[PDB]
């Protein structure tokens, strides 16, 4: 399938957490590391969206409406995928993996546990790289933004991506004629965890105790 192959190549290189070794571990350390991971990640996410067939033809208003409405779903999907091969750990980055003890110290036990729920479902379905990239483009198109101009244009974007996933599962998973749907049926838990993550960090924003860069702050606002 052309779109799937294309999304597979458009898939960016590993990004690193890079927590300072000189600085002693604390909750602000972790929270600041993560917020820095996210600003760098968001930069990449924006240049990747430019490779999604038919996205860049939308207006700048649309492209931005989708993006500021889906960015956290694209970030969590990323964490979730990388963690597929671990037990109760979340791989934010190769150089930054959190287990329970750690997530408590960052006060992200809940958010993380929600994210491991998502992990379990995909682990359980044996989510492949091809399904991950397609699912990510679909989460961007099906973001459900309010301020969208050309509604038909976006609906048309959801449909080419949908058909791409549908083709993949048809040619690759003939034994489960219902796999494309099982995949879509996970988008709801992704939406939920995602807005729970955006809210939580907005609070870290307010409490001023954690420095954040501009992009992460801008998205965290919007």
């Amino acid at each position: 399938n052309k779109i799937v192959s294309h999304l597979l190549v458009a898939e960016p290189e590993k990004i690193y957490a890079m927590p300072d070794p000189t600085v002693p571990d604390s909750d602000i350390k972790a929270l600041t590391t993560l917020c820095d991971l996210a600003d760098r990640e968001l930069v990449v996410i924006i240049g990747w969206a430019k490779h999604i067939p038919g996205f860049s033809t939308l207006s700048l208003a649309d492209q931005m409406s989708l993006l500021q409405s889906a960015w956290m779903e694209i970030l969590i999907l990323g964490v979730v995928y990388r963690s597929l091969s671990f037990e109760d750990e979340l791989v934010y980055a190769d150089d930054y993996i959190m287990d329970e003890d750690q997530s408590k110290l960052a006060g992200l036990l809940d958010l993380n546990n929600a994210i491991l729920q998502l992990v379990k479902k995909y682990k359980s379905m044996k989510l492949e790289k091809e399904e991950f990239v397609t699912l990510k483009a679909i989460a961007l198109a099906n973001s459900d933004s309010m301020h969208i101009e050309d509604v038909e244009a976006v609906q048309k974007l959801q449909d080419v991506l949908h058909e791409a996933l549908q083709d993949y599962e048809a040619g690759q998973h003939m034994e489960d004629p219902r796999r494309a749907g099982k995949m879509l049926m996970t988008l709801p838990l992704l939406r939920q965890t995602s807005t729970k993550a955006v809210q939580h960090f907005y609070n870290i924003k307010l409490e001023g105790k954690v420095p954040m860069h501009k992009l992460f702050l801008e998205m965290l606002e919007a």
């Binding site: 930069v43 430019k50 700048l60 931005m64 500021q68 992009l215 801008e218």
Partner: peptide
């Protein structure tokens, strides 16, 4: 939208 708009635009 300031930053975002620029990254998308360029």
């Amino acid at each position: 939208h300031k930053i975002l708009h620029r990254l998308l635009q360029e």
